[PDB]
Amino acid sequence: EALKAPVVVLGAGLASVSFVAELRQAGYQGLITVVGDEAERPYDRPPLSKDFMAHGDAEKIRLDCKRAPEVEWLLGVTAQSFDPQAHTVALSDGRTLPYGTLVLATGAAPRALPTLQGATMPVHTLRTLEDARRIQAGLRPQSRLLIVGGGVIGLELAATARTAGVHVSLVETQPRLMSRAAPATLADFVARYHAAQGVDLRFERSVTGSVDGVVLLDDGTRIAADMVVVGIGVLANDALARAAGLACDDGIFVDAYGRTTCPDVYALGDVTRQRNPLSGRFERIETWSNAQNQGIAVARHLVDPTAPGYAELPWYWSDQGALRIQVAGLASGDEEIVRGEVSLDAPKFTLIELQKGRIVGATCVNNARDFAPLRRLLAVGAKPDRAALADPATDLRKLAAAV
Ligand SMILES: Cc1cc2nc3c(=O)[nH]c(=O)nc-3n(C[C@H](O)[C@H](O)[C@H](O)COP(=O)(O)OP(=O)(O)OC[C@H]3O[C@@H](n4cnc5c(N)ncnc54)[C@H](O)[C@@H]3O)c2cc1C
Q1: CA separation (Å) from 235 to 79, 154, 252?
Q2: Between the N and C ends of the chain, which has fewer C-beta atoms within 10 Å?
Q3: Helices 288-303 and 14-26, packing angle to 10 deg
Q4: Are 178 and 150 spatial neighbours (Cβ–Cβ below 8 Å)?
Q5: 3-state SS class at 232
Q6: Which residues does 298 contact at the CB level (< 8 Å), separation at least 6?
Q7: 142 CB contacts (<8 Å, ≥6 apart)?
Q8: How far is C-alpha 192 from the geometric centre of its chain's CA atoms?
């Protein structure tokens, strides 16, 4: 009923690939056409601040489009507009695509820093393979890099650059790192780790401008750098949706079926503003797991309307040198339980966030084994014995089973 052929998807990132693979796997055999503005074989972004930044082989980061047979991928083509009455999409190459169902999977773009508009020194953001190549081409040993923003991507780049023998300074407007999506205990530990690896961290500082290779701060001081990478967050790529009259606010509003306010138009991944089931509030979720899992859920329900809506709880990971960080659910509740010691000597620990005895979030540092059972406990809103949660004798995989 809702799934009308032909299917057109705008964007060829993870959300798009995951969606079209699930359409095919679920048994939809109609036309699928995907429009991607990047002239690149679809690829995954997490490597760009990690192993790619370090080793430079793009053929290790391509998405597997095997589970998406009989898809026409229009790469290097921009969707300029769509007409939701005519059920058409206008492309940059002069062609028009008809659709029965239109899927907006256009992701998000790094926010520019207004105070570095008209900088006369290298200022980059890190989103694309082209961005990663341009940054890597300036990552010379004993270079000076300034990162603006203490989000996970800036910190992943900081670790990669330090490992490469690059001097790194980092300016954060907040009093802590990872203010978006991380428990304070984690953010404090992570700052201690980066400081110990030689990152020059500047907290509660904002950039006010730049002059001849030097960045100016709002404490009236200067940081000289060979290169600036700005990581102050992203803005949804929701321009086509806004122009066509869909409900958007830095992100296209969708329900759990991926429906926008425009009939026959859906949206998925980083472009969307959606319900976080743990907070009960709408948020733009900026994670790999959301892009994949939302794309799959929306495709499954299009093919099989008896399937449930998207229901997965949020989580991400970050690889920052010696720290393999995993974070699920909410950053805080009324209670944090710490398993293990929080120590720079062989870091290994777990945080559990509870709200009235109920697990609402969890963090693992170098403890992948405990993250899977904690996500299962989170998913059913488990209320375990807080003494047991704290006790390192406790086996979390066992608790997961018991419930
Ligand atoms: C450097 C980096 C590291 C990351 N590391 C992690 C990590 O460790 N863990 C984690 O959970 N998440 C991580 N993420 C986040 C994760 O990669 C994103 O959540 C994910 O890429 C979102 O996928 P998407 O398909 O919704 O959007 P995107 O990947 O942005 O894909 C959308 C595509 O649509 C294109 N597009 C936009 N407008 C148009 C148009 N008009 N016409 C055609 N094409 C268009 C875009 O240019 C883009 O190619 C990282 C992201 C980056 C950039």
Answers
A1: 18, 16, 11
A2: N
A3: 30
A4: yes
A5: coil
A6: 19, 103, 257, 258, 266, 268, 310
A7: 165, 166, 167
A8: 24
Tokens 């790194």 found at: 168
Q: Which of 19, 283, 288, 313 to mutate to test the pocket of ligand 1 (most atoms within 8 A of CB)?
A: 288
- Identical topology for domains 111-233 and 315-403: no
Q: Hey, what CATH class is 111-233 in?
A: alpha beta
| For the chain, domain boundaries | 3-107+236-314, 111-233, 315-403
Question: CATH assignment of 3-107+236-314?
Answer: 3.50.50.60
Q: Which CATH superfamily is domain 315-403 in?
A: FAD/NAD-linked reductase, C-terminal dimerisation domain (3.30.390.30)
3-class secondary-structure state, position 319: strand
Q: Is the CB–ligand 1 distance for residue 181 below 6 Å? A: no
Which bin fits 129, alpha (ψ -120 to 50), beta or left (φ > 0)?
alpha
Distance CA 326, CA 242 (A): 34
CA of 362 to the centre of ligand 1 (A): 25
Q: How far is CA 252 from the centre of its chain?
A: 16
C-beta of 13 in contact with ligand 1 (< 6 A): yes
Place of tokens 């018991």: 402
SS3 state of residue 273:
strand
Chain center to CA of 157: 15
Nearest of 380, 31, 393, 184 to residue 401 by alpha carbon? 380
Side chain identity at residue 1, one-letter code: E
Indicate if ligand 1 lies below 6 Å from the C-beta of 237: yes
Interval between CA 373 and ligand 1 midpoint (Å) = 28
Q: Which residues lie closer than 8 Å to 220 by C-beta, 6 or more apart?
A: none
